[PDB]
Design a protein around this ligand. Structure first.
Ligand SMILES: O=c1cnn([C@@H]2O[C@H](COP(=O)(O)O)[C@@H](O)[C@H]2O)c(=O)[nH]1
Ligand SMILES: O=c1cnn([C@@H]2O[C@H](COP(=O)(O)O)[C@@H](O)[C@H]2O)c(=O)[nH]1
Lengths: 217, 218
């Protein structure tokens, strides 16, 4: 996946007008947009097609899929039907649940991103201790795309070590949550940025600023 | 706690609006609490919650297994309650702050949070099971009153009931298609969740009626 400027916009605004306007203001800097439930549950799944129609961007559905196999399959189908290019899935629910997603992705020509360790404080309670094993599980299942925490570069580095250089790794927690753009890119292929851009007084300047800080990368 | 008719909750996971509406309408005389998840919502929109309320006089539990950071969890809960859901199911594995975010929104909006502890599928044994007792303990400490536990593992469901106490409300999926027994599950859970055994039946109403007949004494 060739992410322009190694920057993925997490569009979590909950108003169609604002979401489209802000994305439009930073369109020259990105070609990959991550849409999650905040926007989808507020405006509907048709918003994905609208983004592709207006921006011709790659779409990652950050749905944190975390159900049983049968339900995970249905969620992935509905998501790809809406035009998503990839979907983010939790690894904590186990191998069968991840495999369910991989099957649908393969059938519809899409990608599955395995979330191994989250970036918020609460991730330390249960997820962190299982993160390395979840990553190894991904490797065993043939997963090639992963999600790791910008807020813990040592953990992000460990994830990169487990999955190898060939695997693709994206990382949220940059900016608002405290992660540093440049440091995160030492290990991740692309950084995910939400609020630091979409809540900025001038989103375009915010995006341009982040890119300037990682220009040599 | 919510008064679930016949201690039976329908997991409406059909992805077609017409079929979902038909089946739910056919079993409404037996069930007054319906659980709507992403298979239907991502296929027909959040307005489907409103339509179910309009068409049927049923309570709605949004089975969204909320599992994001606090900031995003709050947004998901807000949008879901705004749509008319009476309650929402949240994962406990992402930690206390993520669960607290959901509880805060539920409190401010006058709705309820159900904490999913251990799941009923085989994969749950890999990571969730080992953290389930603590996840439940965490819920109790946070003031969570509603929980979800696995019907497929009677011993685990029993332990979870002990941890949360008799005053807490517990619902349990995995009944029927996944192997759980209605009666056995009701020894510990206040209500059972049933999806496919009802919605894939040739006569959903008869299927629901049959399940209720098997637990009549309960
Ligand atoms: O471990 C994490 C942390 N955050 N996110 C998501 O990445 C974005 C981070 O946004 P932010 O830049 O505004 O913090 C949000 O969409 C959030 O749900 C994840 O997928 N996993
Ligand atoms: O641990 C579990 C297992 N299943 N479910 C949900 O309960 C329903 C079970 O449906 P079934 O009766 O068709 O197996 C589905 O909506 C499934 O996502 C949960 O919330 N948690």
């Amino acid at each position: 996946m060739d992410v322009m400027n190694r920057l993925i916009l997490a569009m979590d605004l909950m108003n169609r007008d604002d979401a489209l306007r802000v994305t439009g203001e930073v369109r020259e800097y990105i070609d990959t947009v991550k849409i999650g439930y905040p926007l989808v549950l507020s405006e509907g799944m048709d918003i994905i097609a609208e983004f592709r129609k207006r921006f011709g961007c790659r779409i990652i559905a950050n749905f944190k899929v975390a159900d049983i196999p049968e339900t995970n399959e249905k969620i992935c189908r509905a998501t790809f039907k809406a035009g998503a290019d990839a979907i983010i899935v939790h690894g904590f629910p186990g191998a069968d649940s991840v495999r369910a997603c991989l099957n649908v992705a393969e059938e519809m020509g899409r990608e599955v991103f395995l979330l191994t360790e989250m970036s918020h404080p609460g991730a330390e309670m249960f997820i962190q201790g299982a993160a390395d094993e979840i990553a190894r599980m991904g490797v065993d299942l043939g997963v090639k795309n992963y999600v790791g925490p910008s807020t813990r570069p040592e953990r992000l580095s460990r994830l990169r070590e487990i999955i190898g250089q060939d695997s693709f790794l994206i990382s949220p927690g940059v900016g608002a949550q405290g992660g540093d753009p440049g440091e995160t890119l030492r290990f991740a292929d692309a950084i995910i940025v939400g609020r630091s851009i979409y809540l900025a007084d001038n989103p375009a300047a915010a995006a341009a600023g982040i890119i300037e800080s990682i220009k040599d990368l």
